Design a protein around this ligand. Sequence first.
Ligand code: FD1
Ligand code: CA
Length: 223
Amino acid sequence: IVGGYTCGANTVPYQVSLNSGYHFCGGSLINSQWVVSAAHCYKSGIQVRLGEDNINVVEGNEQFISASKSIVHPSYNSNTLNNDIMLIKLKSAASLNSRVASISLPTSCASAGTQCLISGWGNTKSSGTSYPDVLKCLKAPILSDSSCKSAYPGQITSNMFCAGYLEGGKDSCQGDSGGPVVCSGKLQGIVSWGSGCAQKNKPGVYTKVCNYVSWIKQTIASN
Ligand SMILES: N=C(N)c1cccc(C[C@H](NS(=O)(=O)c2ccc3ccccc3c2)C(=O)N2CCCC[C@@H]2C(=O)O)c1
Ligand SMILES: [Ca+2]
């Protein structure tokens, strides 16, 4: 997260870190046994880490659970990043408490102007590299479809939405991928992609979760 603030230990209880010997992507806990992330984060041998703050130190509120099955969206296109969503099932259910809680799926799509909370352990520099060990947070409004499409000519599909600042300086970044974009207390987006990080006129592009609610519910109910 570029230009954000330190969330504070366990203040984003639904945030998960996907670990494969190291953190490589974020994710959101939607229920005691299912996590939602970005399809471009797909990898085998994923361990889901819940209750995380400092990912390099065992602080006492963690739950390390291996994934038993990963399901990348049937229509995921790696070249365009269209349908960049993936479901991961935990081998065992997580113990939900105040510090580890699931985030609700939206019942409707959030509108432009809505303020959202974006979080992750990704790079904090727009130019250069510095990965934080504690979770970073960023408040950012959903941008209109017009500004989004104008910022990225011919790359925005009906399953993506821009959120951030056209001025730059504040944005998600490499390592935040798969992470949550919560608006109105529901999961509205998933950190997907962007041109660079915190660049002017190049806001972050997120997977529009409301379009996938049926797919999610159906898959969870039969797997
Ligand atoms: N600006 C943002 N809000 C943002 C959000 C998430 C990730 C990134 C970093 C990166 N932005 S980038 O400018 O480095 C970039 C963008 C598109 C690309 C397409 C093909 C190959 C490399 C690409 C690199 C990126 O979009 N991706 C997602 C898809 C794969 C590679 C890389 C990642 O590991 O997360 C930026
Ligand atoms: Ca830890």
